[PDB]
RNA sequence: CCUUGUUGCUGUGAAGGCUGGCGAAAGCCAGCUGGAGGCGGCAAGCCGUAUUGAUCUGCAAAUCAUUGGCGUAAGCAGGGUA
RNA sequence: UGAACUCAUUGUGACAAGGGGAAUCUGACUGUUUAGUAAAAACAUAGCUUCAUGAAGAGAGAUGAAGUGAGUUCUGCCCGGU
RNA sequence: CUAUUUAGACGUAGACGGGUACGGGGGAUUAGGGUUUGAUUCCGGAGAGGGAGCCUGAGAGACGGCUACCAGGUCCAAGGACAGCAGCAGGCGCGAAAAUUACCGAAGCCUCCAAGAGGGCGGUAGUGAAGAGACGUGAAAACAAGUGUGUGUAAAAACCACAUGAGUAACUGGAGGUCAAGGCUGGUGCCAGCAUCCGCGGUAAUACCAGCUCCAGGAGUGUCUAUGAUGAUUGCUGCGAUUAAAAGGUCCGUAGUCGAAGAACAGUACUUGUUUGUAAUGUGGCUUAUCGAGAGCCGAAUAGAACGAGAAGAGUUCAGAGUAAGGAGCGAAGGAGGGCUAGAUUAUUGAGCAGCGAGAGGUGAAAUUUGAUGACCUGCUUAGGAGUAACAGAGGCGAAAGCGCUAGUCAAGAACGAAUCCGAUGAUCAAGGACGUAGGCUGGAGGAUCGAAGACGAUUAGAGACCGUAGUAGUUCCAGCAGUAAACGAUGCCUACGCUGUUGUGGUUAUGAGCACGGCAGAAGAGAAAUCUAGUAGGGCUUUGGGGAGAGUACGCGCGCAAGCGAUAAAUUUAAAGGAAAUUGACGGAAGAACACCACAAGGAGUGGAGUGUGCGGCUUAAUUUGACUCAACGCGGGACAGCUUACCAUACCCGAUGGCCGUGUGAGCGUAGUACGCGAUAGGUCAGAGAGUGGUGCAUGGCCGUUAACGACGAGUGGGGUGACCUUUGGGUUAAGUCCGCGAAGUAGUGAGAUCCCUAGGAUACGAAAGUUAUCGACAGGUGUUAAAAACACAGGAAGGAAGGGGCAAGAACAGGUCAGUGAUGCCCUUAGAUGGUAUGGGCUGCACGCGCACUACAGUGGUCACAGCAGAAACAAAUAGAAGUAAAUGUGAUCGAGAGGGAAUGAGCACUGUAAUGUGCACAGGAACGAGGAAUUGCUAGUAAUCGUUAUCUCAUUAAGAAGCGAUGAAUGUGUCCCUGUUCUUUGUACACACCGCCCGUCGUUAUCGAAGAUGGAACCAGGUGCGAACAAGUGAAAGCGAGUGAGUGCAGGGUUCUAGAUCUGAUACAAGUCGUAACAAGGCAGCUGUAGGAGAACCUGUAGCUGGAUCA
């Protein structure tokens, strides 16, 4: 019964190409370790609820 | 059917037997002894495959040469008898 | 059974004396046959199966008649015609 | 190595052959016990393209020495010459795979005749994210990498010191679960892709493709491939074998592994001391480079060996010792244990003869078939070959397979009783040996009954099968071969420790009991449960399993006359497996209760046939708008359409929340007999954004309906049982109903049923003076008779008698059941001034070859026609001269008509009514079609019911009922039952079904792919041997010429041993979305299933014979 390759690569061709938008340089070694200590001083409570990431 | 004549040389090595080893048994493996068979190679013989050889006014109204088949046997043969 | 020495072509010196292998058709084997154009795959053979009979100077492990052809493995269906 | 003598040497504790390998010190993982690796700094071995010979030397069978062959090369003047990177750089190939044709009088060492010469050995840098350390990428005031001097070195560079500039510096994999972190926004619609595994995507994708935010590790992070761990899934520590994979059919037996008490003895294992035995690595430490890997120094150490010591266990011996260890023997007794000899009561067939005179046989029902040549049945005679009924059992015997009439005879064994004898003789078992139901095979005997194969008769779409008739090999015996069973209590053999009650068999007994072999019922433990040959446990020995498939199959080998049997692989494929036990449902051509005219029995009226009314399909058309399809679509959508309704078709006309921007009284736009007059913000254009739609999707919904079902069920709290999913427990009587009565590991309250409510039947003492109305009352199986309870019936009184009759309301759960065309109920998609929005005039919804559903008039005389009366539910009715809506009709009496004067279909010219419009309705005259009681089928109905007969001040409605929803008149037949059919509930039981029987599933045939066997004839490599021939070198002998043992490379010719590969054709397996023919299995799956063996057959499979329950029976 009949096989075709007529459709090969279709969806990254249809896609609609978006620019990536520019962003600071982000830290790197003890300096991105102080940021996250400081939003995340929630989460070292034993009572209550950190959420990383919410789309509300 | 009755009475007789006619087996020389060699190969292979069945049944039965004796020793030695192995095995708990049953019975297996060596070496030797023994000498069976419409069994192998030949001799005397009996036969008749090939050369489509010789001969075809023959040596001969069926022979001759070389080459072949069997040859310890449902083998070959004289006389008497049906 | 060994070893050495020896020869100018080498030694079962003349005579006597197997060519061998791979396959297929066919008949099991040794045996027999068209004397004088056919030796065969034809005939025979051991084994297998069927048939008829209580009659004998013979008595069913007997006496005669047919067919197939050693061994192994198989041998289905039909009694309408004769 | 050679001469003569002796036959040895080595093997199941694995010889010999073949395959594979540099060996250790050490490395990786690791709680412990282990599993894997070692070309690779140290030690020892071998090699220098492949083989072989050799001179020199203290030392080589040397290759940066020589000589010859074989395979390859280089230069030439063609005559000859030279050469070997598994040294250091470097090049080409091969591969998925690995650096510079660099500097060196310095460090560590080696070589010479040396106050010096040589060394790619060694050192120094360059190159590369194989591995391992320490740190940058900012701080809150103030931060690498640069540069210059000095150092450093053999010379350098880097490193470090001081001094100058300054302000640079993150990516890889992810975000549904395992597993840390988004239902975010836009594309795509089972596509494209993602995903180790599970799984995503069919227009509402937290999983694809992207954007944006988060997470994890970080100068690093992902992937592929081997291995260790995970893993008690290799089990010494430490798994399993009743049913999941798994105890050999039973014995004997060698090698092997394992083996009393008592008294003594000896030291080789065993354990331990002292001494040896380890550079690096590793282990326990300390000291110096800024720190940390690194470097330097210290201490102890494995296995293996030398010499002493201790004697528990193991070992050796002894007999004034004699196992609930074994063998020999004695006494009395028991048993379908076995071989042989001689007898037996019946029965089934066959023949003979006698009696009788028509059928026998066989089945669910029948046919083949046999009988007047006398069957069948009843007598008497006989001839054979099998078998041992009832007694006969959770009884006995045997190693298992197996063994059942009576006597006599011949060997051996088990158990019991007891002061007999010997003394370790024993347990288990590869190899080897003996037995083994049935069916089968080789030869003989025989042949009653039964019966594979084969042949018929029936049944079926077809039966080749099941059933019946018949019939052969076999079924019996003797002498052998064979070697399998669901050969099963699916539970190996010895030996232990272990609770109670009861019942057997054989001996013995102080009569209390024991010993051997059993059955049964609890308990406690155990186990996933079911259950227990399964409890406790490092006792000994053998067999044996490691996810499904392929496969107990291929090749080789051993046995067999054959049939075959024993033993046993790979390639390939796949996420689970009709894997195990239990639980809840659904189902059964399973069992037992119930129930019901949408079930039947006993009956009564029809429908299906004709003509017409109406709905549905099909076809036609400009349009014939559309939903709904078993009950539960089809006079249904309140669907009786002239307009409207109306969604469809033809033509024509009409319109637009708000906000921004722009433009406007010097006039946006509008009317017109459309160009110059009238009216003026109202209604302009463009972007956003509303609203509207009988447009789409009920598989995006709400609400309401229908159906299960008008059925008996339905959940909560507390207690009980089970590891759990889950069950609340024994199913005996009753009702319409888990409605109730009994009884219980359960008990208490509720929903559903009943009660209540509404109508119909009886009832003033109230109200009225009109004569009726309404009524808190009346019936409860209450009374009698039926001897548990709950109940039921038969009588009797009573207006009314067993839910008084008829309605209405009416659990929980469900269904992708219906409706978006009821809705200012509604999500999302679509259209929106040339509208899918309104309006108007017309046309259609009503068209007609034809198949269906439901109704209405009929087929006459139990009728038709004329006239006359006369009666409902109660109360409504201008007028009308042929006739043109209305207050019953069947019916009662008299006439008439007389067997198509029954019947009114299609149609003619008229006469009126409703209406905006006839196409709709009424009336009169003509006309007079089929139909003479309906094939296969099919629908309600138990009493004021069915059927008959009219009527609606009920609904539709201007006019239209042959439709519904009511209402009254006349009024039966038969039963008062049952579970046979059709279904529905409950309880037991089976299951491979859960998507739930419309389920699930087996095998041929045909088509594709992929991997493997065989096969006439063949190719390659690569090993060792056997024969030829023989280059180089050569001891010896010779003045010499020569001659030449021996060591041998290469190469002839035959063979073998290994590994690959070709091959016409045949034959397996696996995957085939769904092709063809049947339906073999799972329910008593429609003939209960399965194991062995033998025939047969399109194919699953069918048939004979023996066996098993894993069966539909613990009886
Ligand atoms: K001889
Ligand atoms: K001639
Ligand atoms: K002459
Ligand atoms: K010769
Ligand atoms: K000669
Ligand atoms: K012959
Ligand atoms: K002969
Ligand atoms: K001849
Ligand atoms: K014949
Ligand atoms: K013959
Ligand atoms: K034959
Ligand atoms: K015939
Ligand atoms: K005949
Ligand atoms: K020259
Ligand atoms: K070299
Ligand atoms: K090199
Ligand atoms: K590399
Ligand atoms: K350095
Ligand atoms: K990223
Ligand atoms: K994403
Ligand atoms: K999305
Ligand atoms: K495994
Ligand atoms: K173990
Ligand atoms: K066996
Ligand atoms: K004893
Ligand atoms: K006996
Ligand atoms: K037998
Ligand atoms: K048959
Ligand atoms: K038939
Ligand atoms: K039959
Ligand atoms: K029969
Ligand atoms: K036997
Ligand atoms: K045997
Ligand atoms: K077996
Ligand atoms: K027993
Ligand atoms: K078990
Ligand atoms: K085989
Ligand atoms: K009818
Ligand atoms: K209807
Ligand atoms: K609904
Ligand atoms: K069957
Ligand atoms: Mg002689
Ligand atoms: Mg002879
Ligand atoms: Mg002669
Ligand atoms: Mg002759
Ligand atoms: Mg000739
Ligand atoms: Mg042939
Ligand atoms: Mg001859
Ligand atoms: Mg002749
Ligand atoms: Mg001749
Ligand atoms: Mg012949
Ligand atoms: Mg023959
Ligand atoms: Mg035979
Ligand atoms: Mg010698
Ligand atoms: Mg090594
Ligand atoms: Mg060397
Ligand atoms: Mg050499
Ligand atoms: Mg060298
Ligand atoms: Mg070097
Ligand atoms: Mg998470
Ligand atoms: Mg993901
Ligand atoms: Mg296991
Ligand atoms: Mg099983
Ligand atoms: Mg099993
Ligand atoms: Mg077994
Ligand atoms: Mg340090
Ligand atoms: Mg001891
Ligand atoms: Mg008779
Ligand atoms: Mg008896
Ligand atoms: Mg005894
Ligand atoms: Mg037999
Ligand atoms: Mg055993
Ligand atoms: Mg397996
Ligand atoms: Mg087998
Ligand atoms: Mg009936
Ligand atoms: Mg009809
Ligand atoms: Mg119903
Ligand atoms: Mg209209
Ligand atoms: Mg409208
Ligand atoms: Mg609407
Ligand atoms: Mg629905
Ligand atoms: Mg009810
Ligand atoms: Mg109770
Ligand atoms: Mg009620
Ligand atoms: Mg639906
Ligand atoms: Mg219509
Ligand atoms: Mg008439
Ligand atoms: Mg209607
Ligand atoms: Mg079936
Ligand atoms: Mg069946």
Redesign the pocket.
């Known amino acids: 019964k009949a096989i075709?390759?007529?459709?090969?690569?279709?969806?990254?061709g249809?896609?609609?190409?978006?620019?990536?938008?520019e962003?600071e340089?982000?830290?790197?070694?003890?300096?991105?370790?102080?940021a996250?200590f400081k939003?995340?001083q929630e989460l070292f409570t034993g009572v209550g609820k950190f959420?990383?990431?919410?789309?509300?």
């Open positions: 075709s390759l007529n459709k090969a690569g279709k969806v990254r249809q896609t609609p190409k978006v620019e990536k938008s962003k340089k982000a830290l790197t070694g003890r300096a991105a370790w102080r996250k939003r995340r959420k990383f990431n919410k789309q509300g």
